[PDB]
Amino acid sequence: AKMQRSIATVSLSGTLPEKLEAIAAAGFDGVEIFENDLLYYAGSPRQVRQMCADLGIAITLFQPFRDFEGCRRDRLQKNLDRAERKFDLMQELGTDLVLVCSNVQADALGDEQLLVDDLRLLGEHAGKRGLRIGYEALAWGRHVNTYQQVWNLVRQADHPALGVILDSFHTLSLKGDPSAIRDIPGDKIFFVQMADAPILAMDVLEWSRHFRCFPGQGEMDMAGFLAPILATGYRGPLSLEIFNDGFRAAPTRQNAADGLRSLLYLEEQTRLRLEQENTPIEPGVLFSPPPASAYDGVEFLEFAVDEAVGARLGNWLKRLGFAEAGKHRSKEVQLLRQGDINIVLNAEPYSFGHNFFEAHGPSLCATALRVKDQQAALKRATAFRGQPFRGLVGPNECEVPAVRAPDGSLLYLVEQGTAGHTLYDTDFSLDNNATATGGLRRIDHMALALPAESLDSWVLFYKSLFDFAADDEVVGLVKSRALRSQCGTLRLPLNISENRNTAIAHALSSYRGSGVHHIAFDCDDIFREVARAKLAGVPLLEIPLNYYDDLAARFDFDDEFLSELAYYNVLYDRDAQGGELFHVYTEPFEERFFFEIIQRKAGYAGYGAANVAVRLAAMAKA
Amino acid sequence: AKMQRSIATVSLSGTLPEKLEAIAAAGFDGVEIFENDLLYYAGSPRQVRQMCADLGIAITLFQPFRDFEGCRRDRLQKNLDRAERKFDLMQELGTDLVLVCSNVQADALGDEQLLVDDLRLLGEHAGKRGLRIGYEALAWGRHVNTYQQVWNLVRQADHPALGVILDSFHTLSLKGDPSAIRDIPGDKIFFVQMADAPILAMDVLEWSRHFRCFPGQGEMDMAGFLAPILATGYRGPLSLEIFNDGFRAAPTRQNAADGLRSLLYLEEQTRLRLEQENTPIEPGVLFSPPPASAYDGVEFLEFAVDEAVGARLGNWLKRLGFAEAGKHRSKEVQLLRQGDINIVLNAEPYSFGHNFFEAHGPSLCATALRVKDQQAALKRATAFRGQPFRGLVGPNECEVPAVRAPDGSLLYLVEQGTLYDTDFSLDNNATATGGLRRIDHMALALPAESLDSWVLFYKSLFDFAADDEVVLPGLVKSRALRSQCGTLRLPLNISENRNTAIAHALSSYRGSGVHHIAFDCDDIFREVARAKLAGVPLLEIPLNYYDDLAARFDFDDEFLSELAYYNVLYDRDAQGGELFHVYTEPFEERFFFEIIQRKAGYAGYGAANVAVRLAAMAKAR
Ligand SMILES: [Mg+2]
Ligand SMILES: [Mg+2]
Ligand SMILES: [Mg+2]
Ligand SMILES: [Mg+2]
């Protein structure tokens, strides 16, 4: 049996009924009622209980209860009166567990034995009424700020109605070691809150307030936190606590769906962690979906265009060395080919592509991925509740299965590969006299520009459905995020698109939304490709002289070599282990995506992010 | 009764069932089914019909149908077969109207009589099936891009199953005159789509694709477009068409609620426009909520703090001239006063204020408004489906009614009369040490994706008006709202998203909330002198700012050297009106304060000085 999956209402926006319906619709079993949400709900606490019963979700926790233990003695009775009022509220809600977070007042008492007495006294009051106290350490607690101190006090208090509540952010934000959790009896842990976050050198209170996200969307080791918990035997609720609102307008349903998806992904990654530490868990507890299929890069890119822009984009691609490999037999679809790169120009009207073109302009409407096990990829995407389309169904006009990406675009699952004959020999009339005119060989990486508010959802989408991994770089902007398939054949850097309201505020007139940021092709000889591309009319960028003067003062290489780089407008980067990067950029194709040609030498593995400022300055002069 | 209120599914994000449920829950009567939404919906068209029947909403339109009239002749039959396939779909959906938008193909023919014949033939095919064709001009149509051309072709075709569809964006983006709609027979208009937008000097196709918003959230004259429509007698569906988007966000149910709210507000403004043009409408058609109460500025500001931060904030306000007017009788709440400015520092734990402090830090958790008619404000806010709280109910710990702001902060509706004579223990001896006389304006820093919702919130519930400023630089247009008589003024800024603080290496990210609070005075030079001696951290402005003012404006005196010596910032309108204002440093990395002097009727905010303020604040770090 799976654990009771819950989520705190503070993790969503909207009215309390809207949150509860979204939580149930996403497949959660339980919900933490955040007290402030009750305060704004016009109905009664018992009406909340009725809503949860009607929706089939349990109220697994009421929270929070602040600053109890160690407050001044002449207010102790007043704090107990407040506890009794919360007890009254919980019995109308139909829940039996309340979270008590450690005291934050500056004048709070810190004597260990006094805290033991206060916590046991609260446990006695809760136990008398048939309720339970879960004690949580805030990372900024005045006297108690770690789970170790919580267990120390809970153990000494020794009351069955008083237990430990664990919060992954409060422990991992202080770089706490979760290993000692295994020494806590499983039945003394009452509740587990999972919360991920980026690692920031920030005040932990503000860090917790604004940057909590779902497991897998940050850079904390979630599985390494849950693994010691499950080793204790604990099988209680597994929950999520993010602090959103009241700013501003967070999609309730998609946030709830992402939350459940993140718990499914957390369970699998936690299960794998236990298997690798030779302490596996009994089957049937942790989500165990099909492993992701292996990948062999991109099968083809599908662009949504009309006949005018599609011909213009096709011209760009022959100047970049692509051959016209042939036209679709019945549709207005052109195939272009170079090396292992296949690009499909879809100009067929009244179709999935045509809608995408009208909705976004010239854009990438689909990507076919080379997968070794097509059915494994499809079943895993379905297990993580992506939307599949069997072939020739809905927007999927291919015969292989497709997975819907968070926007409208599709991901085709193409299994190699026949030989007589492929996917192209069947639907296209291939000109067996094409041959490309350049030496671009494969798609090395492809960057997306995404809205800031949707990027974490895309990150979780690729991490869970396709088992991608983080691939970030620290270099103004220091950090640029990217994802990567396990074996590196697929690489997906992710940039932040400009909002519409800033395009209005700065009175622009050139605003294109989100979509492909750029597509990068590799080659053997950067100079041979630049020469052919520049002469064929590709609008490659002009790099100022001061850039190459700077390379002279820093790298110290052959003088005859650097003057060639300056003449060929080639940009340069070098790692610490002698690997080198040679890459050039084109201007944006009609104010959207641009192209990149790279040469990787002696194991260079980065993206040349050090040259982004130089690229932006070059594109600026237009 | 009311017209049939609809919204196109393309205006929302989510699955088709989620969209339809949100549309029904928001109170719409109908929905336009965008065909692409059907393509991604795993169920059948009749299941869509069943969902809408279960939810109590009608399918008022199917759309779109592209590039029919004037295409080359060997695709006419193929285009009719495509129309017949759509006819099959609409009958399974249970709708009888399809939108046909004007041709955009480059090789489309524009011969007038041939277009009439094509549209007449399509109308005959629709008429045979008992269905209707609604012809819409796209602003970028190859041959037909105006409603005038549409009506000309529809009139000549002269078929009862072929009518006109009007789209406010397609007309107003071309600056078209909507009055000639009054001459169109009401029964020949089949559908009306309302869409607002900012006026931007850009390609209309991309302008329509990315910047459509709900009526009142943009800059177009929505009521001036609907008024001629209703003059024809048209009482058909009134709908919304904005284009969202693909790339996530957009809360489906809040967007649907905002959409309905925008139609209600549009109906009231259109009613008033027709009443002002001596062409009133029969009662019961257009939304008629209580008119907004008149305002008399801010009664008090309520800040959410703890005792440590609250004392430091009290010190800031004391140095700015505020007197400690007294403490609450039972709670940890301090009252501070200067002129007609009341500031409440709420440090009471285990309360609405305490929850707000833990969620946001030091922040403004509520604003009390001076309203002449308290019940009129409350009934209007409820009529536009805001969330009211009676006193001592929920988060409202005052005894006057409160309206919930989108972020959870409260707006108290205070009728003039004693408010602090009941819960505070007033120090009769207070007396301020300023100076400052009233709150002139309050800027909010809001998320980019939530600002349009806030604009509609204040425009509709409280009848605020647009009050924007256009400067010349980066920043060009600064958004602001304003009460009808100007006693309440609300500039709106865009706060930084958290993922940009992540993308850099930031360590102080503080999010949304109050941007700054501005107090006015008589004598800017006196206040600056008084404030500097009391310790207010006023900004020092570099000389190059005043060298620039020398080249921009001509000065009497002596005078510009005096502005520089007191670090006063300056602006001048075209009517001799002048602004004198200074800024403090931010209070603990959030809001800052502003002292202003308005002289010859200056009405702006001094937006020309934003770059100078930001540069000065950055140097101070
Ligand atoms: Mg917690
Ligand atoms: Mg790149
Ligand atoms: Mg339209
Ligand atoms: Mg101001």
Side-chain angles (χ1 to χ4, degrees), chain B residues 121-247 249-418 420 422-432:
Chain B
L121 174 61
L122 187 58
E124 294 168 5
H125 279 251
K128 173 177 278 181
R129 294 262 224 148
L131 308 173
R132 295 169 299 143
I133 302 295
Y135 190 41
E136 176 199 53
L138 301 177
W140 53 91
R142 182 77 168 75
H143 305 296
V144 178
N145 73 321
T146 59
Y147 77 84
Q148 295 89 333
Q149 293 166 291
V150 162
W151 168 234
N152 185 270
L153 299 175
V154 171
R155 181 184 50 77
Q156 295 186 54
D158 191 31
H159 194 290
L162 167 67
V164 177
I165 288 191
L166 299 170
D167 183 312
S168 63
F169 181 93
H170 289 304
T171 294
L172 297 186
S173 64
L174 304 167
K175 296 174 181 180
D177 192 340
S179 74
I181 293 169
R182 306 170 188 276
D183 301 331
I184 303 179
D187 66 335
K188 297 312 295 176
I189 300 170
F190 286 2
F191 209 83
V192 173
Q193 302 179 286
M194 300 304 301
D196 205 354
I199 298 113
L200 302 167
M202 93 175 52
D203 177 70
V204 281
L205 177 92
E206 309 285 342
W207 187 7
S208 176
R209 172 141 62 206
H210 299 291
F211 297 97
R212 277 183 189 220
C213 51
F214 293 135
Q217 300 176 332
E219 297 171 325
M220 295 172 162
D221 184 15
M222 302 283 83
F225 184 83
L226 186 56
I229 295 173
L230 298 174
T232 74
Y234 176 84
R235 302 294 181 270
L238 181 67
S239 192
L240 298 164
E241 189 191 34
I242 70 175
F243 297 108
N244 272 359
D245 153 34
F247 284 93
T252 312
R253 263 175 170 79
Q254 172 80 45
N255 280 349
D258 284 347
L260 199 283
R261 176 178 284 171
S262 78
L263 283 181
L264 297 181
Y265 181 67
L266 169 61
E267 286 182 13
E268 164 188 61
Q269 300 305 295
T270 300
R271 173 176 56 75
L272 295 166
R273 177 76 58 93
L274 295 161
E275 300 188 0
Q276 290 156 10
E277 300 182 339
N278 298 305
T279 62
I281 195 178
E282 69 265 24
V285 175
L286 300 177
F287 194 58
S288 204
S293 168
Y295 308 110
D296 191 29
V298 173
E299 179 53 49
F300 63 78
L301 301 180
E302 184 181 0
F303 285 84
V305 288
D306 64 8
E307 148 175 5
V309 186
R312 302 195 297 267
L313 184 56
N315 290 344
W316 270 63
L317 297 164
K318 283 174 289 186
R319 305 178 172 106
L320 281 161
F322 285 85
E324 298 188 17
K327 182 164 172 303
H328 197 271
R329 313 195 179 241
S330 49
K331 305 171 174 178
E332 289 299 299
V333 171
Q334 285 288 341
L335 174 62
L336 286 65
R337 278 184 160 162
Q338 177 174 184
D340 283 320
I341 314 156
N342 299 290
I343 292 177
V344 174
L345 303 186
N346 183 0
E348 179 75 352
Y350 323 130
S351 62
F352 151 78
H354 187 202
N355 293 343
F356 209 95
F357 171 71
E358 292 296 327
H360 300 99
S363 53
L364 185 73
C365 64
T367 298
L369 310 172
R370 287 202 191 102
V371 296
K372 150 162 286 301
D373 193 342
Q374 165 186 292
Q375 280 298 303
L378 175 64
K379 284 174 188 175
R380 168 175 192 101
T382 303
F384 284 102
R385 307 165 188 234
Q387 180 176 16
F389 295 106
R390 296 176 211 93
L392 313 173
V393 179
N396 182 11
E397 299 186 10
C398 291
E399 304 206 73
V400 296
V403 176
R404 178 207 146 95
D407 66 329
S409 58
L410 302 182
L411 296 170
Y412 307 116
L413 308 178
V414 179
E415 214 172 86
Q416 184 207 241
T418 318
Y420 321 104
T422 282
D423 315 293
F424 295 82
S425 167
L426 285 173
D427 184 349
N428 221 345
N429 188 52
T431 65

Side-chain angles (χ1 to χ4, degrees), chain A residues 444-447 493 517-520 583 585 594 596 598 606-608:
Chain A
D444 175 86
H445 61 263
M446 186 170 61
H517 187 257
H518 72 270
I519 304 154
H583 59 141
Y585 298 102
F594 57 96
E596 176 183 13
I598 73 163
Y607 296 108

Side-chain angles (χ1 to χ4, degrees), chain A residues 13-14 18 21 34-36 39-42 66-68 71 75 78-79 82 104-105 140 198 200-203 205-206 209-213 217 219 244 246-247 249-254 306 349-352 354-362 387 389 393-395 404 406-410 449-456 458 476-481 496-497 499-516 592, chain B residues 13-15 18 21 34-36 39-42 64 66-67 71 79 82 85 104-105 140 198 200-203 205-206 209-213 217 219 243-247 249-254 332 348-352 354-362 387 389 393-395 404 406-410 445-452 454 474-479 494 497-513 590:
Chain A
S13 65
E18 282 162 1
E21 290 171 8
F34 193 69
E35 182 173 26
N36 201 44
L39 191 61
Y40 285 74
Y41 175 58
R66 304 174 186 274
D67 311 324
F68 178 83
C71 269
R75 288 175 173 175
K78 189 178 182 178
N79 280 323
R82 176 166 59 100
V104 302
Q105 300 298 313
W140 53 92
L200 301 164
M202 188 180 185
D203 179 71
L205 173 89
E206 310 284 342
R209 172 173 289 125
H210 300 291
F211 296 95
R212 277 183 189 220
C213 51
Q217 299 175 332
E219 33 202 4
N244 271 357
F247 320 88
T252 313
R253 294 244 163 172
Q254 259 299 321
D306 63 8
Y350 326 125
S351 62
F352 150 78
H354 187 202
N355 292 342
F356 206 94
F357 171 71
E358 294 297 327
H360 300 99
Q387 180 176 16
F389 296 107
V393 181
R404 185 205 186 266
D407 65 331
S409 58
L410 301 181
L450 299 172
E453 324 79 29
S454 58
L455 170 74
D456 289 338
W458 278 80
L477 177 148
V478 289
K479 193 260 306 301
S480 59
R481 299 204 232 175
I496 298 177
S497 298
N499 72 44
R500 52 181 204 159
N501 275 4
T502 292
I504 304 171
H506 308 312
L508 285 72
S509 94
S510 154
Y511 172 80
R512 312 302 147 95
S514 302
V516 163
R592 330 244 175 184
Chain B
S13 65
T15 67
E18 281 163 1
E21 289 169 10
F34 194 68
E35 183 171 25
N36 199 43
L39 192 62
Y40 287 75
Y41 174 58
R66 292 175 176 97
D67 310 324
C71 269
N79 276 323
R82 177 168 62 101
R85 293 195 303 272
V104 302
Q105 298 297 122
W140 53 91
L200 302 167
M202 93 175 52
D203 177 70
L205 177 92
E206 309 285 342
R209 172 141 62 206
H210 299 291
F211 297 97
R212 277 183 189 220
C213 51
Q217 300 176 332
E219 297 171 325
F243 297 108
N244 272 359
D245 153 34
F247 284 93
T252 312
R253 263 175 170 79
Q254 172 80 45
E332 289 299 299
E348 179 75 352
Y350 323 130
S351 62
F352 151 78
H354 187 202
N355 293 343
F356 209 95
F357 171 71
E358 292 296 327
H360 300 99
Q387 180 176 16
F389 295 106
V393 179
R404 178 207 146 95
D407 66 329
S409 58
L410 302 182
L446 300 172
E449 322 78 30
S450 317
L451 179 143
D452 290 338
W454 279 80
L475 312 93
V476 183
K477 181 162 69 184
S478 59
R479 302 268 287 273
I494 299 177
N497 60 45
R498 52 181 205 101
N499 275 325
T500 296
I502 305 173
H504 298 41
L506 287 177
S507 75
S508 67
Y509 166 95
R510 292 311 169 260
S512 302
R590 333 246 173 173

Side-chain angles (χ1 to χ4, degrees), chain A residues 99 136 167 170 193 212 241 243:
Chain A
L99 185 152
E136 175 199 54
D167 182 311
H170 290 304
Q193 298 177 325
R212 277 183 189 220
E241 188 191 33
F243 297 108

